[PDB]
Design a protein around this ligand. Sequence first.
Ligand SMILES: [Zn+2]
Lengths: 13, 439, 452
Amino acid sequence: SIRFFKPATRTLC
Amino acid sequence: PGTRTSKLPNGLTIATEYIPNTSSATVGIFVDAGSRAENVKNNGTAHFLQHLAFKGTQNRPQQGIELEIENIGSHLNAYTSRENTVYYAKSLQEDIPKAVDILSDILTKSVLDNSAIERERDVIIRESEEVDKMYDEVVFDHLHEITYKDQPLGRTILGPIKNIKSITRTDLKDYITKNYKGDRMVLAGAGAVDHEKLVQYAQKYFGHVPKSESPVPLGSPRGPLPVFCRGERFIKENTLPTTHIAIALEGVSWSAPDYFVALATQAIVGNWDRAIGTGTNSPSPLAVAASQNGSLANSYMSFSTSYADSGLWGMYIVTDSNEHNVRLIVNEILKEWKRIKSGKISDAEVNRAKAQLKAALLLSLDGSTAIVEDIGRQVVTTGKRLSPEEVFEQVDKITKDDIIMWANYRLQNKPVSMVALGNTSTVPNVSYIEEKLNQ
Amino acid sequence: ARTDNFKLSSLANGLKVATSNTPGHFSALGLYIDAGSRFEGRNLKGCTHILDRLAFKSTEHVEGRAMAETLELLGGNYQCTSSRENLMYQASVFNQDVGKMLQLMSETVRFPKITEQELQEQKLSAEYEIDEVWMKPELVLPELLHTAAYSGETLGSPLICPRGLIPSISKYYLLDYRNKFYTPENTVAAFVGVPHEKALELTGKYLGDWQSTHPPITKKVAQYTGGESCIPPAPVFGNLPELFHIQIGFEGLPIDHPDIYALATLQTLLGGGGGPGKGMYSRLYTHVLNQYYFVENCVAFNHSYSDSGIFGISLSCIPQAAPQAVEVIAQQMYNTFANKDLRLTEDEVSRAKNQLKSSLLMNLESKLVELEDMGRQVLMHGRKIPVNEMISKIEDLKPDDISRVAEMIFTGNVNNAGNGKGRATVVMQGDRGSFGDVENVLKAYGLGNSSS
Ligand SMILES: [Zn+2]
C-alpha cells in the first residue's frame, strides 16, 4: 500500500 | 448540483448525485446489517447470504442473472462489512431500471436452495482458509475480538468454521426478515441518473420491503454504545518469518465532531516501509529512527477505523521475527505520539497532513462508483452526506491546536488493546505501553 | 466536441491547448509530448524512461526539495509516465491549484536541471527496476512480442532498456533527446474542468515564450515484419505451478483506423482470462478455459498504435500441454471467420458490442482518464472524437463487420502505411521443442499470408 484508512470487508470479488 | 434525497413510504432513502457528461452510472443498495447484526451462533450469516444472493431468485435462475448482466455490459458486485451489506451495479444509463430491478430481486427474492446452501459451506470454508494466510487480516480480527470483548463488533464477518457448517436456511431467512427494513437501507446512485425517476423505480422494485415497527433514522444510535476493552492477545508462532503487531485506543465514530481531526493526527504520524521510506519528501523523527542502525522493523502503518458508534485508532507494525526487538520500535512510536501530545510539531507537517487528508478523501471521489460508495456509506451509517465541498471545509479548518488537543484527550490515560502474531518473545506488555505513553 | 464542451486552440509557438467538460469538485491537467521508446532508435535507447523517472526533480527556478514539498501540498496526485508512443505529465488537483501545478509541470518540462547526482540516482535505480521486470511474464512476453513483430525497430524497439545500456545514458544524450522532442509544436496541454479561457491564460503565462529548437525530423513509420522468438522456461519457484507461455499475433490496426471499433468488438467477443459481467461468456472462456484446464490463462490482446498494431491471443499452460498450444489458438482464430458452423452469432456480437461500449464509457467516468484520452487524441490527430460518434460507430456494427475484420487480420491482409508482411508473430517462454512446428500448424489453418 501507500498512505491511509483501513476497515474490513468480504466481497463476491 | 449536490446530493438529492428522497424517502420512500416504507422508510427507504434514495440519495443521488448527477454527473454531467456521462452515459453510465452506478446504483447500489446499502443495508445497515453486516455481522454486527448477528449473534454468537448466528455469526457469519450476512456473509453467507451475500454468496447465495447470486445463486438464483424467484424470478431468475443463477445463469439467468449472469447472462442478462453480461448482455447489456453491466457489472454486478457485493460486499459485507461489520456494519453493512452492499449490493451494487454499474451499467449504461439505459439499464438503470433493469439494474434496480435485479438488485432488489437478488436482495429480497433470492431462492436460497438447500442444495446451494450445502455446496456453499465448502466455498466459505475455503475462503476462511485464505484469510488465515493474510497476517494483517488475522491480527485485526483478533484485535476486534478482544477490544470489543463479547460484543457484536467483536465478531468477524465470515464467522467461525463451526457456524459455517451449522448455518441453516432458517437462520438465513430470519436474518433477512429481522434486518431488511426500508428504514434501514439506502438506494444510492450517481452518474447519468435522474433522481425523480430513480425514486419511482425505487418504489416500484423496493416498495414491497417491510418498514420496521419501531423505525429509527439511519443516523440514530443502534442502542448501548460499544465499549472499548483494554486487553492483549499474544499469538506465539515461531515458524513465522515476520511478526505482526497492532496497537489501538478507542478512536472516533463516523459522525464525531473530531472525526477529521483524528484522521489528521493519523496522517501526521503516517507510515513507513524499510525499503520504500515514507513516500514523503521529509520523514518524521519516528521514520528516521525506524530506519537507523539496522532498522527497527520492516514497516509500520498508522490506521483508523470508524463505525457509527465507535472507532479504533492506532499503529500496525511488521517486524523481522529473527532480527527485531519489537520493544524498540514500539518505544519510538510511543515517543512520536508523545511528541504530538507535547505540541512539538511544525506548521509544515500539520499542513502536509491536511493536504494528504484532503487528497485522500476528495481527489479519490472520481468515478460514479466511488461516488456511490461515498453517498451510500455516509447516508447508511450517518443519515446524511457531507458534500466534497463540506469535507474540504472540515479538513481545511483543522489547526495545530485541534490536533494537540485531540491527542492529549485520546492518547493520555486511556485504555489500549493489543495483538501480536509471530515471534512474541520480544513484544511488550499492554501495561508497559500505557505506562510509557502516559508517562 | 459539442456535449463534452471540448475546445481547442494553439499558442503562437504551436503548443496546442485542449479543454473539456465543465466545473466539478476538482480538476485534471497534463502535458503530453509526442515521444516514447519508438523514437529512440539505437542511439537514444533508454532515454525516455530515464527522463520520466527524472520528472519533477530540481529545475532552474525551483529547488528539488521545494518542488517535492509543494507537490505534496497540492495533494501529491501527480505522475509522469511514458510508453512506446507517449510521454506524459499528469495530475488531478483542487480547482484553485491548476495554475500552480501547471507552473511546476512546465518547470520540469522546460527547465529541468538534471544534476550529476539526480541522474546517478535514477540510473542506479533503473538497473534494479529492470532486474525485477525481467521476472514478470505479464511484462516480458508482451515485450518479446513487439520486438519480434517489428524486428527491433520503432514499435518493437525495446520498451525495457537493456541493462548494459543504462550506465552509458549521459546528460548529453538526455539533452539530445530533449532538444529533439521537447518542443512546443510537439506538446499538448490538456485540462478537464477548467474554462478554456483560463487555460489559454495559464498556458501562455508558463509555456507561451517557449521556442522550438528546430531539430531534424526523425520519425519513421512502423514496419511490421512478424517473426519468432523463445526464451528459457522460468525458474521453478515455491509451490507455484510451472507454466509455459505463448503469444500469437498478426499485424493489427492503427487506433484511428475505421475498423478499429469492429476489431475491439472482436477482441471483446474473444475475451478470455485466467460478480457477473466479468466476460465468462466470451469465446476464449467457453471454447478454451472451460474445455482444457491444462490451460491456466488464455486471452485476446489488441495493441493498437498511431500507425500499426498487433492483434492476437495469449495462452499459458502446463509444460506437458505446450505441444497443443499452437493448435488450440489456431482453431480459435479460424473459428471467427472460416468455420461455417461457428460463424459469429447475433447474440455473441450484440453482447460484445455492449461490453465494449460499457468499458469505454465507464472508464471515461474518471477525470484522469478523460484527460489522458483527450491529450493523446489531440497529440495524435489534433481533434477529440466526440463520445456520441464513438458509440454510434459501435452500435452500427453487425456480425458480418466483425467477420470481415477477423478474416482480414488473421489472413495477414492488413495494409498499413508501413506495408507490413502477413507473417505471424509468435513468441514463447519454455522449451522451444515443446511447441512443435509452429508455422506448419498456422498454415494448416490458412492463417497468415505466404505470398507477398
Ligand atoms: Zn465470501
